[PDB]
Amino acid sequence: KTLEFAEELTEKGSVFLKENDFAEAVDCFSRALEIRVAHYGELDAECINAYYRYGLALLAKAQAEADPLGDEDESDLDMAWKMLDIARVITDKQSTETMEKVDILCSLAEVSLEREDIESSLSDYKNALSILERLVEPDSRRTAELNFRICICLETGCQPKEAIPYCQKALLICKARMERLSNEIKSASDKEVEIGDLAGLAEDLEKKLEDLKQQAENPKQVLAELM
């Protein structure tokens, strides 16, 4: 019932989650959240973390208990959505947007992908990216990553034309970060290793961009514009 006991439940839930004991992790995080809500209120800022942890554990559980070939799984997904969305709504009442909000939005996007809801995941990622563009440097790897996740959501959703500028942005971010590290060299070993890493990533992104431009030329994709 005390806050310290909720803290013990949270630490043990984290351990259970690392050890792939998803059921017990969800039980611990559920109990910690209930204690925190009873102390601070259902929609209080002090509960954000506990909602987030619980949502994350539920997502993990739903992913591990699904069989791709073919319910606890759908119920856990719906509850993960609920808990992460409450974390988001509470976060929305704070003046400054933080990386925790970015992360909550990315976790919500992943829930939506598991529910096969590409539109929601798209909105979640776009929101997260617009926050990230205020929080971190223009050539941040996290910004490149979110651009890429947007473009693959759009590709899987039959919108390759729209995916193209997001993939291009991810590629340009990788090359800009390359050139910036190159100028800084002008830890040196660490920067040069990262330059090579980014060059490989850029080539993978350039291949993805070629495939996207080809998909956007498919007759059904392009006829409306041609007409």
């Binding site: 790897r141 890429f148 996740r149 693959i152 890493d197 990533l201 993978d204 993805k208």
Partner: peptide, 15 residues
């Protein structure tokens, strides 16, 4: 569905 190569590339981009 999203290809596993694309998931891996997203994680590599993030690092």
């Amino acid at each position: 569905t999203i290809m596993p190569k694309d998931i891996q590339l997203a994680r590599r981009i993030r690092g």
